[PDB]
Amino acid sequence: MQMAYRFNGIGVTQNVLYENQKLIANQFNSAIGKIQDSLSSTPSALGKLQDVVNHNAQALNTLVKQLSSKFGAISSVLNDILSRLDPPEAEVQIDRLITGRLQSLQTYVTQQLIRAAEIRASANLAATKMSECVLGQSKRVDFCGKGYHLMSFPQSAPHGVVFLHVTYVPAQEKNFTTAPAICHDGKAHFPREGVFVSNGTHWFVTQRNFYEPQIITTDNTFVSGNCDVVIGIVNNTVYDPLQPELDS
Amino acid sequence: KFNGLTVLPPLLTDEMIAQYTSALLAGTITSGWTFGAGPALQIPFPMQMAYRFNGIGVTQNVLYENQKLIANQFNSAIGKIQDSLSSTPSALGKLQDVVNHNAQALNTLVKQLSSKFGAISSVLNDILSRLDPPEAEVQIDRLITGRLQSLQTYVTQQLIRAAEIRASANLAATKMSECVLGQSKRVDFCGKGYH
Amino acid sequence: LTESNKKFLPFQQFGRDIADTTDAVRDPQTLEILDITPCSFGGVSVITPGTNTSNQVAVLYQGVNCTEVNVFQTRAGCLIGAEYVNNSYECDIPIGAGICASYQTSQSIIAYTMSLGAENSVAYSNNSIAIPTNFTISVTTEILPVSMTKTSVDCTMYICGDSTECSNLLLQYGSFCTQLKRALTGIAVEQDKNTQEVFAQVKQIYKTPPIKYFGGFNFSQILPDPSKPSKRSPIEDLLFNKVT
Amino acid sequence: NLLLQYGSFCTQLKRALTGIAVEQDKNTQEVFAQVKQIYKTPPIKYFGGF
Ligand SMILES: *[C@@H]1O[C@H](CO)[C@@H](O)[C@H](O)[C@H]1NC(C)=O
Ligand SMILES: *[C@@H]1O[C@H](CO)[C@@H](O)[C@H](O)[C@H]1NC(C)=O
Ligand SMILES: *[C@@H]1O[C@H](CO)[C@@H](O)[C@H](O)[C@H]1NC(C)=O
Ligand SMILES: *[C@@H]1O[C@H](CO)[C@@H](O)[C@H](O)[C@H]1NC(C)=O
Ligand SMILES: *[C@@H]1O[C@H](CO)[C@@H](O)[C@H](O)[C@H]1NC(C)=O
Ligand SMILES: *[C@@H]1O[C@H](CO)[C@@H](O)[C@H](O)[C@H]1NC(C)=O
Ligand SMILES: *[C@@H]1O[C@H](CO)[C@@H](O)[C@H](O)[C@H]1NC(C)=O
Ligand SMILES: *[C@@H]1O[C@H](CO)[C@@H](O)[C@H](O)[C@H]1NC(C)=O
């Protein structure tokens, strides 16, 4: 029933769900099954988290390497700069080492601050995606997966979150002849929801997202104007449900 | 900007970018928002505009009975966009600011090569041919430190600017997804008025 | 040195441009103007498939004209060892300026102009509309980093180990050893806040009913698995196994 | 030679610049490569008066 809620949300009537409940359940189950196989693939789609981990490790290792660097001094060793040189020259050598290593620390902290800003941007995006994809149904286009968003599921991952976006994708299009409106008695009828289509001889009114034709009546259409101003209006007959019941 | 500094060409040429924008325009014109959610489904453009009017809360008959006036208004507004983009030079000035900032950074680095940095000379060969090599190592080391600090601060500022540009590109991609590939209900996200 | 069309005033010797780099020189013996161009240089990229595929590579000298070094010339530089086909496929290895490279077939390395996608024409008409008759339910994936590793640094210990003659002089570099610590502490607190914002979004802790029948939909792949020591779903378990 | 007792400074800087350079192409692709195919308008450019 909440799947019917969500189908109504994306613009499809809920009888489409109720009449295809087992087909939709099977499609969802097959897609969920294929997700696990897709993740366990050679591209290793878990690239962002691995890149974050590798960047952190590389920064730490570079900071470690910067210790064993003379920075223009006699040597990078702690005691060997004092057990050999005199206190006066050892003073400037220690100054050289201190400036170099504190510069390394400052550079590392600056890079970490920039990377933390980037990670905070990503985390804010993930938070809004959790709020709008998971805690609700999003009408934003391509925000929550590709297609008409139906729902979403979160999955924790090391230093990240994985969203499984369930979306509704149209599959088998058919071409029809359409019309902005139709005429019955010098009146112009526009569809309340859906569009007017023709299979070649008859005219029906469907919903815009799924081909479910219905007979054009005074319940699916509303009248506004006449057959004078609408460019492309087509003659037809508009069934009145009141006539058979009143005559009988 | 050519003293050890290189400008790499972008992977996507302007020909390809124009092709992508042409594809997006053709999809929007010939299918509406349907090509951004799945297969492209053809729809007469007046009917697509009626869809969009219905989406902003205005019934279809308002479009269909005012189709010529709306088409004329759209054409006039597009012509005015052409004229406005032609004039008022500080309108498309964000891209110019980006280009100018990059050029400023590059030129600052290149002419910061010429800085003395407290050394006796700004040319390595002047030190190597005027002061004896055994004690020229101190001057060479201080010049190296100066140039290394200059390059490091250039790289850090490039990283900050790249973060700013990444934010702008993320916003532009979101706007392409939401305003171009669909119709947005978010206020003022896709321009003033009802999108 | 090359012949130049510049018009130095009779008293001018050097020649410069922006950033003050010598661009031209007047020759002392014979009065001529020679333009100076820096000797060619540039990075050397190696276009390679995986070593699990082949040990054969192509070499891109970027920016370098194909005269200071099969030999193809792209706007990104000169390519050596890759044959330029006239076809167009999706980009496998991006070289630049619209040119990509791949390992294809004579199983070798080819270079081409990348294709932007399959060409498609929409059957537009005044009164024709395409309406779907069926549909599919598609589950896609988005991976999003939320936090990094929180790291603290002991500046006094890092700069040198057991040494007081360090700290005596280092004290004169005032506040540099605490500003970095403050910045790192801020970063760590921000990481914790990032995780809190992303995940701590429910006041209650909800539980699925013991009967996991939801109208035919099967959530066993995403629901917690009690069998594992950690109550992680099979997908979550796979994610933790993969990223190590 | 003196520069190479610094060592990882230049590798750090080169890697950072390469990351920026590849992120630029990532940005451009993320913005413009929205569409899976390449659509073309029909040879008749009549769209109801627009
Ligand atoms: C409908 O018919 C037109 C007429 O040629 C065709 O171009 C279009 O592709 C058809 N729609 C389909 C097959 O979905
Ligand atoms: C169109 O209308 C109905 C389809 O439900 C059918 O009775 C009629 O034969 C159809 N005509 C065609 C397909 O030409
Ligand atoms: C049928 O449509 C034509 C225009 O296409 C119109 O002139 C005619 O009056 C319509 N038929 C009736 C009975 O009104
Ligand atoms: C230098 O001597 C050569 C030899 O004849 C002569 O051609 C040239 O004009 C002289 N240049 C100057 C500046 O005296
Ligand atoms: C490389 O040099 C050759 C001649 O030296 C010529 O094709 C052109 O100047 C360069 N090629 C380019 C820019 O594609
Ligand atoms: C719709 O597609 C499903 C498989 O995706 C198929 O089993 C079913 O028969 C199709 N129905 C129609 C009306 O095309
Ligand atoms: C749900 O899917 C799992 C596979 O992940 C399967 O083992 C289980 O039997 C399914 N549940 C059903 C069919 O009720
Ligand atoms: C109907 O379509 C034709 C091409 O099929 C084109 O001229 C235009 O879109 C419409 N005709 C007129 C006269 O506007």
**Joined tokens for residue A41:** 């693939």
**Burial annotation C155-174 (CB, 10 A radius, 16+ → b, else e):** beebbbeebeebeeebeeee
| CA C65 to ligand 5 centroid distance, Å | 6
Q: Among C213, C217, C218, C222, which residue has the most ligand 7 atoms within 8 Å of its CB, making it the best to mutate?
A: C218
What is the DSSP-derived secondary structure letter of residue C217?
B
Nearest atom in ligand 5 to C65's CA: 1
Q: Sign of the C-alpha dihedral, residues A79, D4, A99, A101?
A: negative
**Joined tokens for residue C238:** 């796979």
How many Å is the maximal CA-CA distance in chain B?
92
Nearest to C120 among D25, D37, D48 (CB): D37
Q: Are A141 and A158 in contact (CB under 8 A)?
A: no
Q: Report the 10 Å Cβ neighbour count for A78.
A: 18
Candidates C62, C50, C141, C63; CA nearest to C92 is C50
| CA B44 to ligand 8 centroid distance, Å | 11
Tell the residue nearest (CA) to atom 5 of ligand 8. Answer: C125
Q: How far is CA C121 from CA B27, B31, C187, in A?
A: 9, 11, 51
What lies within 8 Å, CB to CB, of C47 at 6+ separation is C57, C58, C59, C60, C79, C82, C93, C95, C101, C109
Does ligand 4 have an atom closer than 6 angstroms to the CB of C10? no
**Residue type present at position C183:** A
B169/D contact by beta carbon, under 8 A? yes
Q: Are A146 and A167 in contact (CB under 8 A)?
A: yes
Residue A40 in 3-state DSSP? Answer: coil
Candidates A146, A53, A73, B118; CA nearest to A82 is A73
Task: Give dist(CA A116, CA A112) in Å, integer.
Answer: 6
Residue ranges of A 180-199 with Cβ closer than 8 A to chain C: 195, 197
Contact D8 A62 (CB under 8 A): yes
Candidates A114, A111, A82, A106; CA nearest to C158 is A106
Q: How far is CA C49 from CA C70, C93, C107, D18, in A?
A: 18, 9, 12, 20
Task: Give dist(CA A240, CA B151) in Å, integer.
Answer: 81
Q: Among C122, C127, C128, C129, which residue has the most ligand 1 atoms within 8 Å of its CB, making it the best to mutate?
A: C128
| CA A203 to ligand 2 centroid distance, Å | 9
B154/A contact by beta carbon, under 8 A? no
**Joined tokens for residue A188:** 């112009």
Q: Report the 10 Å Cβ neighbour count for B55.
A: 15
Neighbouring-strand partners of residue A178: A197
Neighbouring-strand partners of residue A221: A191
Q: Are C77 and C63 in contact (CB under 8 A)?
A: yes
Order across the sheet with C58-62: list the strands: C44-47, C58-62, C77-80, C72-74
| Residue C101: φ, ψ to 5° | -135, 155
What was the elucidation method? cryo-EM
| CA A212 to ligand 2 centroid distance, Å | 14
Q: Where is A102: in which H helix or E strand? A: helix A87-129
A178/B contact by beta carbon, under 8 A? yes
**Joined tokens for residue C99:** 């040119």
Resolution (in Å) of the shown entry?
A: 2.9
Q: Are C88 and C118 in contact (CB under 8 A)?
A: no
Q: Where is A179: in which H helix or E strand? A: strand A173-179
DSSP for C94-156 reads EEETTEEEEEE---EEEEEEPP---EEE----SSEEEEES-EEEEEEEEEEE---------HH
Q: Are C39 and C65 in contact (CB under 8 A)?
A: no
Contact B8 D21 (CB under 8 A): yes
- Residue of chain D whose alpha carbon sits nearest to that of C98: D25
Q: Are C77 and C86 in contact (CB under 8 A)?
A: no
Long-range CB pairs of C65-70, under 8 A, 24+ apart, other chains included: C65/C40, C68/C40
Q: Where is A196: in which H helix or E strand? A: strand A195-198
Residue B45 in 3-state DSSP? Answer: helix
Task: Give dist(CA A64, CA A76) in Å, integer.
Answer: 13
Nearest to C238 among A40, A82, A106 (CB): A40
Q: Sign of the C-alpha dihedral, residues A184, A189, A193, A199?
A: positive
Q: Where is A157: in which H helix or E strand? A: strand A148-157
Q: Are C23 and C16 in contact (CB under 8 A)?
A: yes
Contact A141 B44 (CB under 8 A): no
**Joined tokens for residue C100:** 């990509």
How many Å is the maximal CA-CA distance in chain C?
99
Q: Sign of the C-alpha dihedral, residues A160, A161, A162, A163?
A: negative
Nearest to D48 among B19, B45, B151 (CB): B45
Pairing of strands C108-113, C99-104: antiparallel
Candidates A154, A53, A108; CA nearest to C219 is A154
Task: Give dist(CA B165, CA A194) in Å, integer.
Answer: 42
What is the DSSP-derived secondary structure letter of residue A239?
B
Q: At what angle do helices A87-129 and C176-199 cross, to 10 degrees?
A: 20
List of chain B residues whose C-beta atoms are within 8 Å of the C-beta of residue A142: 36, 177-178, 181-182
Q: Sign of the C-alpha dihedral, residues B79, B82, B86, B92?
A: positive
Burial of A28 (0-12, 13-18, 19+ CB in 10 A): buried
Contact D41 C119 (CB under 8 A): no
Distance from D16 to chain C by nearest Cα, in Å? Answer: 15
Task: Give dist(CA B101, CA B122) in Å, integer.
Answer: 26
Q: Are D9 and B152 in contact (CB under 8 A)?
A: yes
Distance from C200 to chain B by nearest Cα, in Å? Answer: 25
HSE toward the beta carbon, residue C107, CA cutoff 13 A: 5
B193: left (phi over 0), alpha (psi -120 to 50) or beta: left
What's the distance, CA B152 to chain centroid? 25
Does ligand 8 have an atom closer than 6 angstroms to the CB of D49? no
Nearest to C116 among B20, B38, B107 (CB): B20
What lies within 8 Å, CB to CB, of A199 at 6+ separation is A176, A213
A27/D contact by beta carbon, under 8 A? no
Beta strand segments in chain C, E: 2-3, 24-26, 33-35, 44-47, 58-62, 72-74, 77-80, 83-84, 93-96, 99-104, 108-113, 119-121, 128-132, 135-145
Task: Give dist(CA A224, CA A181) in Å, integer.
Answer: 10
Q: Length of chain B, please?
A: 195
Q: Are A177 and A198 in contact (CB under 8 A)?
A: yes
Does ligand 7 have an atom closer than 6 angstroms to the CB of C238? no
Q: What is the 3-state secondary structure (H, E, C) of B140-166?
A: HHHHHHHHHHHHHHHHHHHHHHHHHHH
**Joined tokens for residue A26:** 């099977």
Q: Report the 10 Å Cβ neighbour count for C152.
A: 9
Rg value, chain B, Cα: 27
| CA C115 to ligand 3 centroid distance, Å | 51
